[PDB]
Write a protein that binds this ligand. Structure first.
Ligand SMILES: [Pt+2]
Lengths: 122, 98
């Protein structure tokens, strides 16, 4: 009986831990990237790989938000929230670091939310 | 550590026919570590860490597009990062496509 309870709790905690962080990714508009990284993550689960998603988000964003790019793309506006737009005299702030801090907030969000519903079921 | 205002110029010119190349030149003081080319919308930018010593008092960076189209036209300006602080932005340059 204990085994089945632990397994059901692990399943419930995985499915619920991912939803809050999908909120996190569509707040960054990982939705608009035409690579398809977002849809891929949602199909393959494994929510705590989100910091992985981070590095690709940087590469793609750099390409699509460059001063070189042909046309306007929705994701570029999120940079202002990231804080990578500099006031004169300010520190440099690396985009990849800001993206990782966003999704580390998302991931510890997810872990401590999943810890409660792991114990709740049993 | 006050950082001087950088400057933008366009080579060969401000006005480019569609399909031709143009190069944006950002110039600042010696020892700038990063140069950033910016459009009217501040979130659209390119960073580069190759800077070349032009002079004992100046340094520059180059952003080229191999052929323009009507989406490239607009306002452009530079900022540089040197010695722990970002600089002030340069004056705008408008490149127009023909
Ligand atoms: Pt830096």
């Amino acid at each position: 009986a204990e085994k089945a309870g632990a397994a059901a709790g692990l399943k419930a905690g995985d499915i619920h831990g991912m939803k809050i962080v999908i909120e996190g990714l569509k707040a960054l508009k990982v939705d608009t990237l035409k690579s398809g990284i977002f849809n891929s993550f949602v199909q393959n689960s494994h929510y705590t790989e989100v910091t992985g998603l981070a590095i690709a988000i940087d590469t793609e964003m750099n390409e699509v938000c460059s001063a070189t790019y042909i046309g306007i793309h929705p994701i570029c506006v999120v940079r202002e929230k990231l804080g990578v737009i500099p006031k004169a005299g300010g520190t440099m702030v690396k985009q990849k670091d800001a993206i990782t801090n966003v999704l580390k907030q998302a991931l510890e969000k997810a872990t401590q939310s999943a810890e409660a519903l792991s114990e709740t079921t049993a | 550590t006050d950082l001087p205002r950088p400057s933008i110029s366009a080579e060969p010119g401000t006005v480019i026919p569609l399909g031709s190349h143009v190069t944006f030149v950002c110039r600042g003081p010696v020892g700038v570590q990063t140069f950033r080319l910016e459009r009217e919308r501040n979130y659209l930018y390119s960073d580069t860490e190759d800077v070349s010593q032009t002079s004992p008092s100046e340094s520059e960076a180059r952003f080229r597009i191999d052929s323009v189209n009507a989406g490239n036209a607009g306002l452009f300006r530079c900022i540089y990062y040197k010695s722990r602080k970002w600089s002030e932005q340069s004056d705008y340059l408008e490149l127009v496509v023909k």
